[PDB]
Amino acid sequence: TRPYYSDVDIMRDIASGLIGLLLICKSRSLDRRGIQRAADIEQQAVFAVFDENKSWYLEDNINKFCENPDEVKRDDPKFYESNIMSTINGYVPESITTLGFCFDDTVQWHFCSVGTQNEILTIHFTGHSFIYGKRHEDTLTLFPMRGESVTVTMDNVGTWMLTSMNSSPRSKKLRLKFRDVKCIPDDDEDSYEIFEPPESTVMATRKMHDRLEPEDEESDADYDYQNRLAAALGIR
Amino acid sequence: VAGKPGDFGYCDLNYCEEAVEEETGDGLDEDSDRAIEGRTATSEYQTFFNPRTFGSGEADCGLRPLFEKKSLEDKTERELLESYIDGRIVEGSDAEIGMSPWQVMLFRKSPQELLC
């Protein structure tokens, strides 16, 4: 995970929504898009606290784009905290998606939290955990500037909260409401999810049915059968 | 040389035992990098001998009316990557009539025994 941003400005363009994420992947280039072997989709988590005065478009708030010249919303704590907001996927209150995965989900969770801070930021997970460093930890700690990546397999049944333990503006409203259920494998026999165990009546073609006429898969597709045998992972 | 109207001998000289292995100069190459998967080749063969004093064997090459012009694969060249699963102990599987066209050997008229 390597989040990108504008290079003309340093701190003001980040507040204006000019930040993303780049995937500097390894040597798993299968086709023109690179089939992510032993992987799946991606679920990120961003929490950037910025202000309108930090962005370059401060003029599009109270002076130019304005319709109340008699009462200026400045020098008051009401308009200040109205701009100080923590966003996620462009959604300041709550996101439209949930973290309800299932079994056999070899996804890669990403985390980021940029802004005007400098120390480390943490987040507590109640009833849920992850896998990193050949172990099984509960909570993690991200870092700014760079991007933190971790391959997490979400296997759980039930619903809990993911709140933090800080002061008040970052511990009372930084929760998450989602339901994780897998009945029985990936829970795709009577619900709605973009997965498939399959484990059902397969009288024709379904999921996990890699039957090709020439050759299914192996390592690459350099030729019709790949005749040069030297597939490494970098400079030898 | 003279002697008999046939061949001629070559001179020999004791040089060195330097092998033609990897070049020790610099450390770079000059080979290709891909050749994209996709049979886009009409007839780019080469010719060294002359059909006049040698005969055929110049154009009719690599064209077996089996699984070559039809762009198909049978049970012959089944060699993928060397990192199949590495290698243990070889066994030698079975075969099938029709996969070994060329077969030039030596025999004797009396008795009929296999040679080399």
Swiss-Prot record, chain A:
Sugar attachment sites: 53
All residue ranges annotated as the Plastocyanin-like domain in the record: 35-183
Residues annotated as site: Cleavage: 33-34, 206-207
Membrane-crossing residue ranges in chain numbering: none
Phosphothreonine, modified sites: 139
Effect annotated for changing residue 112 to R: In THPH2; Nijkerk
Record PTM Sulfotyrosine, positions in chain: 192, 223, 225
Disulfide bonds: 102-183
Protein's name according to its UniProt entry: Coagulation factor V heavy chain
Curated annotation (Swiss-Prot), chain B:
Tissue note: Expressed by the liver and secreted in plasma.
Record annotation: effect of changing residue 39 to Q: Loss of cleavage by factor Xa
Site (Cleavage): 39-40, 88-89
Posttranslational modification: The gamma-carboxyglutamyl residues, which bind calcium ions, result from the carboxylation of glutamyl residues by a microsomal enzyme, the vitamin K-dependent carboxylase. The modified residues are necessary for the calcium-dependent interaction with a negatively charged phospholipid surface, which is essential for the conversion of prothrombin to thrombin.
Location(s), subcellular: Secreted, Extracellular space
Other information: It is not known whether 1 or 2 smaller activation peptides, with additional cleavage after Arg-39, are released in natural blood clotting. Thrombin can itself cleave the N-terminal fragment (fragment 1) of the prothrombin, prior to its activation by factor Xa.
Disease: Factor II deficiency: A very rare blood coagulation disorder characterized by mucocutaneous bleeding symptoms. The severity of the bleeding manifestations correlates with blood factor II levels. Ischemic stroke: A stroke is an acute neurologic event leading to death of neural tissue of the brain and resulting in loss of motor, sensory and/or cognitive function. Ischemic strokes, resulting from vascular occlusion, is considered to be a highly complex disease consisting of a group of heterogeneous disorders with multiple genetic and environmental risk factors.
Function: Thrombin, which cleaves bonds after Arg and Lys, converts fibrinogen to fibrin and activates factors V, VII, VIII, XIII, and, in complex with thrombomodulin, protein C. Functions in blood homeostasis, inflammation and wound healing. Activates coagulation factor XI (F11); activation is promoted by the contact with negatively charged surfaces. Triggers the production of pro-inflammatory cytokines, such as MCP-1/CCL2 and IL8/CXCL8, in endothelial cells.
Entry's family note: Belongs to the peptidase S1 family.
The protein's assembly and partners: Heterodimer (named alpha-thrombin) of a light and a heavy chain; disulfide-linked. Forms a heterodimer with SERPINA5. In plasma, interacts (via N-terminus) with alpha-1-microglobulin with molar ratio 1:2 and 1:1; this interaction does not prevent the activation of prothrombin to thrombin. Interacts (thrombin) with iripin-8, a serine protease inhibitor from Ixodes ricinus saliva. Interacts (thrombin) with iripin-3, a serine protease inhibitor from Ixodes ricinus saliva.
Name under which the protein is recorded: Prothrombin
Species, as recorded: Homo sapiens (Human)
Part of the full-length chain shown: 276 to 391 of 622
